[PDB]
Design a protein around this ligand. Structure first.
Ligand SMILES: [Ca+2]
Length: 214
């Protein structure tokens, strides 16, 4: 029994809750370097992640993650992804070898090439391939909506504005992980994300995050 239920409205910063990625790159398909200066807190209480450029063809992106780890329960987020070919805005749980565990993760990803859809996925002991793309019936980039997943031992249920949209029923992840949010441009995955055209700055915003334990 790991982290407890919490509600994060992003109104002020206190130690022991979150951390910014800074100064290194995830490498691989991630074609940008994380910068702390790209994670900003607005005065009206939003977490704003930016994708910017320093110099020609050099991109800086952003990632914010919890310091504690959290297990089964309901994860909800009110967010507004960026819209642009070649990028991703996300909300996901994650644990892996860096944390000394197997790779388990549950994702909500908005492919910026088409923000009228959302991609749900998950990895269990490093096995992925569960991508499910759902049509939202609206352009998520235009305003805030609530996205959520209920993660229980026998299923993952994802919801959009409170409506059940997808249910996964096998090989569900079991290792508590950190809550993460990131915005990045890829390379090497044009088929998935579209080609990134260098447009910047781009922002994804998060108004709140809530986790309710069992
Ligand atoms: Ca807020």
């Amino acid at each position: 029994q790991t982290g407890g239920s919490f509600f994060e409205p992003f109104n002020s910063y206190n130690s022991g809750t979150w951390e910014k990625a800074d100064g290194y790159s995830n490498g691989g398909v991630f074609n940008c370097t994380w910068r702390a200066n790209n994670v900003n807190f607005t005065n009206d209480g939003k977490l704003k992640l930016g994708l910017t450029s320093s110099a020609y063809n050099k991109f800086d992106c952003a990632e914010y993650r919890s310091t504690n780890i959290y297990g089964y329960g309901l994860y909800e987020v009110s967010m507004k992804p960026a819209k642009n070919t070649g990028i991703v805005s996300s909300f996901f749980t994650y644990t892996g070898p860096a944390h000394g565990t197997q790779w388990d993760e549950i994702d909500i990803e908005f492919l910026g090439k088409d923000t009228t859809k959302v991609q749900f996925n998950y990895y269990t002991n490093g096995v992925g391939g569960h991508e499910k793309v759902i049509s939202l019936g609206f352009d998520a980039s235009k305003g805030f909506h609530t996205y959520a997943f209920d993660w229980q031992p026998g299923y993952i249920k994802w919801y959009v504005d409170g409506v059940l949209k997808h249910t996964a029923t096998a090989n569900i992840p079991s290792t508590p992980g950190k809550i993460m949010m990131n915005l990045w441009n890829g390379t090497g995955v044009d088929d998935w994300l579209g080609s990134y055209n260098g447009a910047n700055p781009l922002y994804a915003e998060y108004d709140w995050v809530k986790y309710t334990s069992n």
